[PDB]
């Protein structure tokens, strides 16, 4: 395996929890952000390149492409980071961080919000600014690519619009 920031947490701090590179698509992920408890001595492939090596995939939860995908339990693909941040979604196995399931428990309202970053409605499940009584909505990956503050912390997962970026 080959051991640039982890595209799930956007942190470059490598260490016991290394950043792996897919030997086919050059995806870079922490073994703990993507669910890789054992690293192979030879080539490592992400789940997308194991299954759909010559075809990119769509996220079931956002309109954006690229980054780190797992299969869902219902015939789709989703971003790890989208599954992490949407409250009703989860991972069936929390060590392997797969499959992504419970997408059917997302309230229809999330698909009716308008992402204020890409301005699209109905193309993914939005989350909202964690600020009380701020209703600004965004896709998880749109918040990531736009550089909004997004923190997971022992586990609370708080994301903020640019008005409400918290002290730090």
Residues within the interface to Zn ion (CB under 5 A): 6, 8-9, 22, 24-25, 27, 30, 33, 46, 49, 59, 61-62, 79, 82, 115, 117-118, 129, 131, 134, 136, 139, 141-142, 161, 163-164
Residue 60 contact, options Zn ion, Pr ion, none, Cβ 5-8 Å cut-off depending on partner type: none
Alpha-helix runs per DSSP H in 67-120? 80-85
In sequence order, what E strands does the chain have? 19-21, 28-30, 69-71, 77-79, 90-93, 98-101, 127-128, 137-138, 150-153, 156-159
Q: How far is the CB of 70 from Pr ion (least distance, A)?
A: 14
Q: How far is the CB of 36 from Zn ion (least distance, A)?
A: 11
| Spatial separation of the C-alpha atoms in residues 104 and 109, rounded to whole Å | 12
Closest CA to 130 of 98, 163, 99: 163
> For the window 3-32, what string marks contact with Pr ion as x by the rule CB under 5 A?
------------------------------
Q: Which residues bind Pr ion (CB under 5 A)?
A: 73, 101
């Amino acid at each position: 395996a080959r051991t640039a920031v982890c595209c799930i947490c956007n942190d470059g701090e490598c260490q016991s929890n290394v950043i792996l590179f897919c030997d086919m698509c050059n995806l870079a992920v922490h073994q703990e952000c993507y669910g890789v408890p054992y690293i192979p001595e030879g080539q490592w492939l992400c789940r997308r390149c194991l299954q759909s090596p010559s075809r990119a995939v769509d996220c079931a939860l956002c309109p954006n492409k690229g980054g780190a995908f797992k299969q869902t339990d219902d015939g789709r693909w989703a971003h790890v980071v989208c599954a992490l941040w949407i409250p009703e979604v989860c991972f069936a196995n929390t060590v392997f961080l797969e499959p992504i399931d419970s997408i059917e428990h997302i309230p229809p309202a999330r698909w009716k919000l308008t992402c204020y970053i890409c301005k699209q409605r109905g193309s993914g499940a939005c989350i909202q600014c964690h600020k009380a009584n701020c209703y600004t909505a965004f896709h998880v990956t749109c918040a990531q690519q736009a550089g909004l503050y997004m923190k997971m912390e022992p586990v609370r997962k708080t994301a903020y619009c640019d008005i409400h970026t918290p002290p730090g």
